[model samples]
Target: RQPPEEVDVLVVGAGFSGLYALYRLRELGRSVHVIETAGDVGGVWYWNRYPGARCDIESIEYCYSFSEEVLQEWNWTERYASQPEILRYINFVADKFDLRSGITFHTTVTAAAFDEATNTWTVDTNHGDRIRARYLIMASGQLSVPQLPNPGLKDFAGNLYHTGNWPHEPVDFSGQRVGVIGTGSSGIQVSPQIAKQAAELFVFQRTPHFAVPARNAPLDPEFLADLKKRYAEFREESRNTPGGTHRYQGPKSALEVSDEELVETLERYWQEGGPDILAAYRDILRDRDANERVAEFIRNKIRNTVRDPEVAERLVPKGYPFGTKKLILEIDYYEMFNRDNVHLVDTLSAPIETITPRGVRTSEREYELDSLVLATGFDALTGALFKIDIRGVGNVALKEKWAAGPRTYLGLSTAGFPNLFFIAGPGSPSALSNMLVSIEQHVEWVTDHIAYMFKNGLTRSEAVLEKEDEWVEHVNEIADETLYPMTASWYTGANVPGKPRVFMLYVGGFHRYRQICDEVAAKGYEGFVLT
Candidate 1:
């Protein structure tokens, strides 16, 4: 290339994290540029164009709180925003803030290596470009990369699709036999939509997951106007909460209450709708018995909704604690099973053998389908980072360093990585909270830290080796105390086979993690070396 592009800061991924980082870094008078693989912005909302792809969090809460002007100007049409609506909002933000000018679209970072002599990174991209930057901010999201479970995917002769990497154009499943795999959020959301159009829908589910109704509705103009007035104060309260949402967490444990009382309380939330039902009891995630009680109520709802007893039995989640895994927010997902054309292939009873030329072949028989939708979730936190060849101190490859699991101090910086920061990185309370809030917090912190280094005349900043060890230990200790690690959820890197089964996210609350991050920065970036 012609003399390698140079900037003070080069950010990867133009999602919420990367965009916010660019906006904030520019305000700090730093030269910054962004590179994204996608043709456009929107991140999760960009690629996930599958039918019924909607956010579980309400539109009011799942948004940017950093800018008062942006908050007041934008109007949300519904309680929950769909993929398109979210993408539109992101586009509006990009235009309103002039964010697109600094970004290079349709470019992927291939490698980023730090130079010991200059304390800067030499970054390479897929588009035959080498970039140099003082600081490299990784805004690659937790769930950016899609995963296909079956190794023999190439063998499938029929149409194959992934919910995560859905095509930009509208796909027609009309009058076609469609087979949907996985029971994660994407599967739950997309299957119902597929059921309506597909001539026949086969849902191959391995594990049943807890799902709450998404009582989505159009937002009244009056309500929208009212929210804009005290938006900042409202977001501050959210920042104080565990999950960074307006959901009211119950004080009592489900185990302590009588079945009569528990049912009545849970019934109210069920009627109200949303994943907030998981917050119905205080000890639901902490205590196994407490979790089972809550799970029973949800299972009862499912059994009562679906007419078929066999299907209901298959849908009831067991052997896992509720709320420990991210609960699915459903809009007619359970009721979709009642349709005559819809079929549930319980894979646990008949494990999948391989993908045949015709269709998926299980231990029982092959289920022929015109199209197959893999609603299997992403490789999660580690997948996107591993796609690149990143070298830190002593030319150590990041993939080899994190072969056991991702190790970082406060999920911001790793020990050997200097002048590199991660926004909502693994080892933080990343996927556990309202992702928009988490992204903003991480972006602000990382950008402010970068400004700090320049102002203080420090050339390099990295997490201490001993501090990283302690942070890893602390994350694991906290995770073990809860029911999170007990299940085989994506939070534990269990979705991708052969990946390490360790719980990656900090089980600590978002407020607590923020407090810890702020405290460290306040104490001259404690546990990090600044030189």
Candidate 2:
């Protein structure tokens, strides 16, 4: 073990959130450093190199706004950038800012425990390195960790893969029988790419997800030039919106509009091809009937696209409202099901029993495959945090404290845990919006709070326990008002078996959530205790 290094702040990631956190802290003149598990930066983009992986949010709006120089200088090639392009953009920013110097790569934080006597956190890494800091910021990302189904997966005698932990090099599935389990965003995106090369592709689906067309295109340099002139104005517009996107939100409810008007409004967004459909009606996510109105329209479109009625019906997502679960952005995902080589294995009808030596065995039949891909979703929001052995005052385990679910004051800080913060966490409008927007908001807010603490000569800070309880109740109350919790999705922590099924994120709009955060900060971080 090496001697412990002391710093002002310790960040636990190297992605968009962590990199920004590192940059901002240096600007504040604080002694800070980042610890990342990856060989380099670009956290999510660094690991998830699966085929057809791309950002659902448009490239123009999905970047950092803190650096005006970087924004004006860098150019995005596509409307919706691919994983590689996003990674390149992250690398560009890292290089431009010389951020690598302050980051320790190929390192994982195994444990973080706060010491009341010293008023600091002692962080331990897997590499036998240790560090103590006044503050510990977990930019560990909401969807950082990947979860696979079945405990006995290693016994399978085939190429096993998880989309979240994909290989760096290209995977050639040509002349091979490939099986994809789970049909979330990763499954929806990866299957089409695999279908092109695989001799036979089987998609084992437990539930169908609502996906809209992502009509991605090359960004014209002329358009980019015009946008750059008013990029600040564009970003401000995004920040002010509900979902933090540059699109206009509708004013009317789905029920308020006539059938003709609804179809016309929806058709415009559908033809344009983006996430604009959800914004077509203000009450789409609020009312079940209103959601069904839009759901039926999308269902009709899905059936029309596929040649087979039975197959199309199997693909139609039922028992849940649209726009509730993470609405996937599909690029020919539904059309791929029409291919002769593509086969749909509905796991709901025939439950997966276990993983056999050759392939997967289900209640109905056995699947033989050359390669298997687990498109199983993440544990989300709290998963990454739970990975670390974090303890608060009295050595109270964070795992035990949050065994019911994640309980935080404002999705920024939790009770009992002083000087510890979570970026893009459960109690906020995190996964509900353009993640970059939320990530930037959180990094900026948390760092500014740290700066404020330093300026005020405060050595300790923690959220009031009452405030955390109030906030948790507030999040649940707001979620129950909407149809968001009706379905079992990653947002509700339902993807991983035995995990709590609590509705995690704040269902309140991003603009509303941002205002709340601002008010709290402006009022001397009202709910928190600083001494």
Candidate 3:
């Protein structure tokens, strides 16, 4: 409906990836325009304002490590940063770097089509504006889209909320009955807080999740001082670690040690409160028996925490491998059920019939509630990308291309999508790894590749078809080697109904993935076609 505004690069989504992309490209003297749907730059954090929401990673390590000045100046009050604090940090970064000048807030890109003749992309947005750019960088986050609740959600007359896209204003659950659906990370984090306020809380869980105590506390000054002294080493260690979080010491294989030694090692990691418990054994990810041992350990912990034996049995997860889905951390999640005011309802036994005006009705009974919260996670990986109508190479729709599943080489570029790149999209160590570390690695890699193309006078670069096929096979091979595929988790696109059941992320460690990506780049981007 409107004429296109020409720019050197058009970046979509204002999350960490998009923000960094804009900052990097602008530094390189490239005219970049960023379009964000949110009124501000916090992206996911801007929207997910649910009660008790906080980052599981420690505040010191969760932030941007690119600038020394920014790192030294900002102070984190707690070991685990709450959502409000994280959002504030994001806003601070936007202001400090003047990233808002190029970013057009409260705008959504509806469609982006590649024009072959000019070797450019034409982006159309909801604001009746079009933009033409030589490169289209989608920093659309992996978990940007909020997965709608079940079919009967609209029928509910009670106050309903989604943790993924919570209201900006505070929700008053004080002295009111509350119901929470889905026991993922958000549920695990928010339930304990909500239980404290609500007169009665009903947690409708489908699958019981394995959760470790976060053991969150105020940041110790001495710890901070020591960490600051070795900041460079911390960054290097995080880069080398499988996930980007710098806390774990990358333990050796559990099988190498005797059963007594293995138990002691797991106990040590369990008390440490992090995802490294899964990494305590190298075979945990690959061997089913090894994973079962870890799962049983968590189940035992859950049983020990919850007073009721029946409730604890229902709360323990049985179907999935340990690291298949993103593990959850909690302060007192399992222990919350021990409260007399709290109740756990397993929906697997009796399906949710409908949401009545007052409460939810299952096949067996009806439970009245004053408020409802759906912590039903995101569509994840490809959800954000599919939101926009992306057409590349002869009008091939991105949605149609990914109908079976997303196909990308190294999780960076897709075949037939010339000059288009996705940061931390499907096929990468995205949700499985430390997100901040992964984001920086992807953004830098993409930025450098673009610079290379510019220097070589290359108009377009796409993943080679053969390489894409091989890479997809390689990703699947890595996943199949482990017990990760044995269960239905969001990692395999299993959470969303009718979505293709393909393992979306690479199970290979971040270190290994980085090595492979580096090797590919060193080989002159061998698996790509340069035009």
Q: Which candidate should be chosen as best, given lDDT against the real structure?
A: 2
Per-candidate TM-scores read 0.98, 0.98, 0.96
Candidate numbers sorted by lDDT from highest down: 2, 1, 3
Better of 2 and 3 by lDDT: 2
Scanning candidate 2 in windows of ten residues, the lowest lDDT window is 1-10
Query: Which lDDT tens digits does candidate 3 get at residues 262-327?
Result: 667778887878666766767778777777777777778777887779888898887777767778
lDDT of 1 at 400: 93
Clashing pairs in model 2, backbone N/Cα/C closer than 3 A? none
Give the count of colliding residue pairs in each prediction. Answer: 0, 0, 0
Model 3 per-residue lDDT at 356: 86
Cα error, residue 419 of model 1, in Å, equals 1.1
Worst 10-residue stretch by lDDT in candidate 3?
246-255
Candidate 2: C-alpha lDDT: 0.91
lDDT of 2 at 481: 90
What are the C-alpha RMSDs, in order, of all predicted structures?
Answer: 1.4, 1.4, 1.9
